[PDB]
Amino acid sequence: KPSIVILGAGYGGIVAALGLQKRLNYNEADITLVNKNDYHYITTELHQPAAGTMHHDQARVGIKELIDEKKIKFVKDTVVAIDREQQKVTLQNGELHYDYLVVGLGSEPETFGIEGLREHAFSINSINSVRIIRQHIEYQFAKFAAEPERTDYLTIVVGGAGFTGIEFVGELADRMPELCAEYDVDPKLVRIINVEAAPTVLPGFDPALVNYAMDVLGGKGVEFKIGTPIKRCTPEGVVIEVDGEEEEIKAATVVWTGGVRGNSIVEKSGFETMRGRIKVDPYLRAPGHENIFIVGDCALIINEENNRPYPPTAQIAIQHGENVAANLAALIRGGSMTPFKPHIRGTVASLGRNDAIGIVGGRKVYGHAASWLKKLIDMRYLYLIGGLSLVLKKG
Amino acid sequence: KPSIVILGAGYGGIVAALGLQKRLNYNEADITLVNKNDYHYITTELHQPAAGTMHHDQARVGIKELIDEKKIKFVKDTVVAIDREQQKVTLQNGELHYDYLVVGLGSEPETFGIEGLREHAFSINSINSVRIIRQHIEYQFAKFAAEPERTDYLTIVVGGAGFTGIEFVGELADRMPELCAEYDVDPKLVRIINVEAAPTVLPGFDPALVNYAMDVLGGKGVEFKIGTPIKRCTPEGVVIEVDGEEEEIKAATVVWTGGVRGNSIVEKSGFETMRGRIKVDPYLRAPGHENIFIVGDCALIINEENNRPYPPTAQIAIQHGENVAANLAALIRGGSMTPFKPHIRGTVASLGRNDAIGIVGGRKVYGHAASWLKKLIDMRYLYLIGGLSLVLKKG
Ligand SMILES: Cc1cc2nc3c(=O)[nH]c(=O)nc-3n(C[C@H](O)[C@H](O)[C@H](O)COP(=O)(O)OP(=O)(O)OC[C@H]3O[C@@H](n4cnc5c(N)ncnc54)[C@H](O)[C@@H]3O)c2cc1C
Numbered sequence: 001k002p003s004i005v006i007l008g009a010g011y012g013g014i015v016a017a018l019g020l021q022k023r024l025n026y027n028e029a030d031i032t033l034v035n036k037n038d039y040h041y042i043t044t045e046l047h048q049p050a051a052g053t054m055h056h057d058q059a060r061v062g063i064k065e066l067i068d069e070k071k072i073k074f075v076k077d078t079v080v081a082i083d084r085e086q087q088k089v090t091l092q093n094g095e096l097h098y099d100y101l102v103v104g105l106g107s108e109p110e111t112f113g114i115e116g117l118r119e120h121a122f123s124i125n126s127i128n129s130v131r132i133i134r135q136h137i138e139y140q141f142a143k144f145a146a147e148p149e150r151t152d153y154l155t156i157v158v159g160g161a162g163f164t165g166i167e168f169v170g171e172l173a174d175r176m177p178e179l180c181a182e183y184d185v186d187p188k189l190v191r192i193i194n195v196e197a198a199p200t201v202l203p204g205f206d207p208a209l210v211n212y213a214m215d216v217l218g219g220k221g222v223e224f225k226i227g228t229p230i231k232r233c234t235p236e237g238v239v240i241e242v243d244g245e246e247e248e249i250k251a252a253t254v255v256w257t258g259g260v261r262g263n264s265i266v267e268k269s270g271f272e273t274m275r276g277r278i279k280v281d282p283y284l285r286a287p288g289h290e291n292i293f294i295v296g297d298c299a300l301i302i303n304e305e306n307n308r309p310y311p312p313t314a315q316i317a318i319q320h321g322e323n324v325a326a327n328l329a330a331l332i333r334g335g336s337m338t339p340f341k342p343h344i345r346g347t348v349a350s351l352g353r354n355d356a357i358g359i360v361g362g363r364k365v366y367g368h369a370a371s372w373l374k375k376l377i378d379m380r381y382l383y384l385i386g387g388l389s390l391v392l393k394k395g
Numbered sequence: 396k397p398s399i400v401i402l403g404a405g406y407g408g409i410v411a412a413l414g415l416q417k418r419l420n421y422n423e424a425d426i427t428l429v430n431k432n433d434y435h436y437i438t439t440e441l442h443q444p445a446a447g448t449m450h451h452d453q454a455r456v457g458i459k460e461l462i463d464e465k466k467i468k469f470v471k472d473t474v475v476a477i478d479r480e481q482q483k484v485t486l487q488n489g490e491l492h493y494d495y496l497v498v499g500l501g502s503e504p505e506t507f508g509i510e511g512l513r514e515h516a517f518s519i520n521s522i523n524s525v526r527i528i529r530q531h532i533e534y535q536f537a538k539f540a541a542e543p544e545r546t547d548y549l550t551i552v553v554g555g556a557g558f559t560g561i562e563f564v565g566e567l568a569d570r571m572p573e574l575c576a577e578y579d580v581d582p583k584l585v586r587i588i589n590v591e592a593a594p595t596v597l598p599g600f601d602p603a604l605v606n607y608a609m610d611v612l613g614g615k616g617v618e619f620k621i622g623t624p625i626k627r628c629t630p631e632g633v634v635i636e637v638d639g640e641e642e643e644i645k646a647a648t649v650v651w652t653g654g655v656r657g658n659s660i661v662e663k664s665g666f667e668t669m670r671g672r673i674k675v676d677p678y679l680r681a682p683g684h685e686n687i688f689i690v691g692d693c694a695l696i697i698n699e700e701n702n703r704p705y706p707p708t709a710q711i712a713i714q715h716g717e718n719v720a721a722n723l724a725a726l727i728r729g730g731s732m733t734p735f736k737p738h739i740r741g742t743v744a745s746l747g748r749n750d751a752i753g754i755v756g757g758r759k760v761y762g763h764a765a766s767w768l769k770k771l772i773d774m775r776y777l778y779l780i781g782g783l784s785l786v787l788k789k790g
């Protein structure tokens with residue numbers, strides 16, 4: 001009986017696990033799934049609870065509730081390192097030995113050594129961290145009525161106007177009315193400032209969408225500062241460079257959405273990595289190891305359409321999962337492996353709960369329609385992992 | 396009658412014991428403290444009596460004087476082994492059974508298998524042993540006037556230019572003028588030689604301090620031999636490797652400060668150890684034993700923030716103590732445990748009685764100032780274990 005160890009119950013790991021579970025049956029292999037928490041979180045929805053537009057329990061689901069415990073042994077613990085030579089994974093409260101290893105430990109923030117950013121800005125990357133953001137923001141608003149001079153309490157800076165930054169400010173902007181009512185704040189004093197170093201918002205995207213987004217978000221009070229890098233970050237706010245000169249923004253809340261890297265454990269375990277990620281072979285294995293598969297944000301894959309990396313996304317992470325599960329079953333039953341074939345469909349960026357932009361099936365989409373697509377597309381994933389029960393449970 | 400046994404009345408054990416004492420009331424548990432001597436010694440001060448710069452009684456205090464006998468039963472005896480299966484500790488003059496076990500048996504010298512080092516060099520590691528070093532040194536100086544050819548009587552070799560080695564040579568150097576006057580010795584003949592295998596003095600420290608230290612100590616007659624390992628040790632001195640030549644140093648006194656390891660009783664009792672130490676779980680317990688806590692130099696903890704182990708220090712040992720005491724009180728009361736968090740502040744290395752280097756509150760410090768900080772910092776611990784009575788009793 002071979003031992004399969006899956007590190008990380010995120011998009012990659014969970015999907016890998018649930019695949020193995022459908023593809024094998026009892027006693028074909030040992031399958032141990034390791035996650036730091038006993039829940040799996042819908043990472044792509046985390047911007048909502050961060051802003052408080054959706055309760056966090058809707059963006060997580062219990063792992064035991066998803067799996068067949070006869071088929072998969074679930075371990076709640078925190079990975080510390082990987083010994084490749086000895087095929088041991090060292091946990092915080094024990095060790096595990098594997099024949100096959102699947103690594104899906106996701107991303108960590110990248111602050112590019114920008115001063116203070118690490119210590120003094122928040123990140124949207126877990127359930128814990130979004131509850132902290134959400135409550136931090138509400139606390140600032142509560143403090144305001146008693147110190148109406150401190151408009152900095154009402155100023156929220158979001159670093160990076162990429163996909164995540166936009167989604168987050170959109171959620172913030174929807175929420176402001178309710179928030180201002182709860183705490184007797186004059187809406188006109190609130191400042192949501194999205195600060196991007198590059199010359200445009202959503203650098204890399206179709207300008208038609210960018211402009212539509214800027215228009216909607218500007219229409220709800222979002223200010224954009226473009227071509228504007230963050231020189232440093234403090235408990236009081238950020239310092240930016242405008243026209244080669246330092247200007248301060250006083251902001252009681254600063255959130256960084258400006259960059260991610262491969263979970264650092266991969267590098268520290270001695271794999272060769274680019275920006276913390278592994279450039280995998282065509283079956284998603286780590287170079288040098290015919291028995292180690294890397295999934296999700298830990299994996300780097302070059303796109304053949306251009307010659308640029310594929311970006312780290314849930315969409316591709318899910319696909320990594322399905323592939324590794326199929327290919328591992330093959331390995332186990334002396335079947336054959338199929339190399340990985342990313343089929344990247346389109347994505348939609350939400351703009352608050354009622355509006356959205358995206359390119360689906362080659363075609364641009366907006367507003368109520370775009371919103372529904374995203375929701376539908378996202379429901380596909382729930383269905384994938386928990387069937388109708390789950391799709392309904394998000395009811 | 397939950398039986399708590401604490402093995403070793405050093406920084407970890409004593410502080411654990413005095414915590415339990417404050418946190419529990421009568422008959423909540425049996426607390427037995429075991430130590431080989433009926434005194435507890437201030438290990439961090441032992442370099443002074445070793446050189447004779449401070450009487451040894453100032454670096455020890457009676458255990459009974461510190462504890463409440465109604466709360467804690469003190470046993471003077473010597474641990475021989477631990478039976479995990481039986482939950483029995485074998486003493487030299489009896490046995491003890493435990494429900495909970497706290498291990499704080501401190502360090503033993505690490506000689507890295509170097510020939511003779513164990514049998515022919517001294518260690519600064521107890522009150523007994525510093526008295527022996529001190530009286531050994533004085534005896535050599537007394538012998539000299541009657542055999543002026545034997546300048547080896549005036550040669551003292553200190554192995555290791557780490558924290559301890561530097562502190563010791565600094566003490567030796569302060570003391571030399573008095574020692575030469577007592578025994579009619581020509582100062583210019585005295586040789587204090589600090590021999591380090593690594594390529595620098597104080598490897599791991601800020602060079603600004605290193606250089607300042609080398610300057611002060613060189614100014615007082617300390618010679619440094621760096622990148623120079625000790626090939627062997629004999630009653631007549633040490634053999635070292637210079638370039639590739641084995642070169643002898645004739646020295647009537649040799650002291651090893653070059654390395655420590657976890658007390659050997661831990662390994663021989665069958666716990667898995669790295670360098671004699673246990674890699675404890677987040678509540679300081681030995682992996683596989685939910686009822687055994689390890690403290691002080693027996694415990695190994697990795698610095699997530701450099702991925703290298705924390706060094707074995709009194710500072711962290713004290714903190715282990717407090718945590719184990721809190722957590723045990725919890726366990727006794729069916730409560731829940733708080734995991735451990737090292738808060739490592741800064742340390743000062745003395746350089747004789749009137750000079751010192753260190754980093755405190757992020758900032759470097761030297762001379763008279765540095766000296767006072769260390770003295771104050773060290774009084775905090777006395778206060779911690781014996782209040783103002785003690786701080787005064789050392790005054
Ligand atoms: C706000 C936001 C919106 C996004 N929206 C989209 C989108 O709309 N479409 C899209 O394609 N992508 C989107 N993404 C990106 C997508 O979320 C990620 O690429 C995807 O989550 C990567 O999946 P993963 O399984 O590699 O890692 P993650 O989803 O990050 O999962 C990692 C898992 O491992 C666990 N873990 C990590 N380290 C340890 C450790 N040391 N020990 C034990 N457990 C550990 C974590 O708890 C977690 O369960 C978004 C990201 C964010 C932040």
Ligand SMILES: Cc1cc2nc3c(=O)[nH]c(=O)nc-3n(C[C@H](O)[C@H](O)[C@H](O)COP(=O)(O)OP(=O)(O)OC[C@H]3O[C@@H](n4cnc5c(N)ncnc54)[C@H](O)[C@@H]3O)c2cc1C
Nearest residue numbers: 403404405406407431438439474501691692707708709710
């Ligand atoms: C010269 C010197 C200077 C130092 N300076 C500093 C400093 O400035 N700052 C700092 O943080 N650290 C310093 N240290 C380190 C510090 O001394 C140790 O980290 C610390 O003593 C460890 O505490 P502990 O209680 O684990 O062990 P110890 O202090 O070694 O106490 C162990 C106890 O166990 C007893 N014992 C051992 N074996 C047995 C047995 N078999 N039976 C019964 N009893 C036993 C001993 O009597 C002793 O009471 C210094 C050490 C030295 C030698």
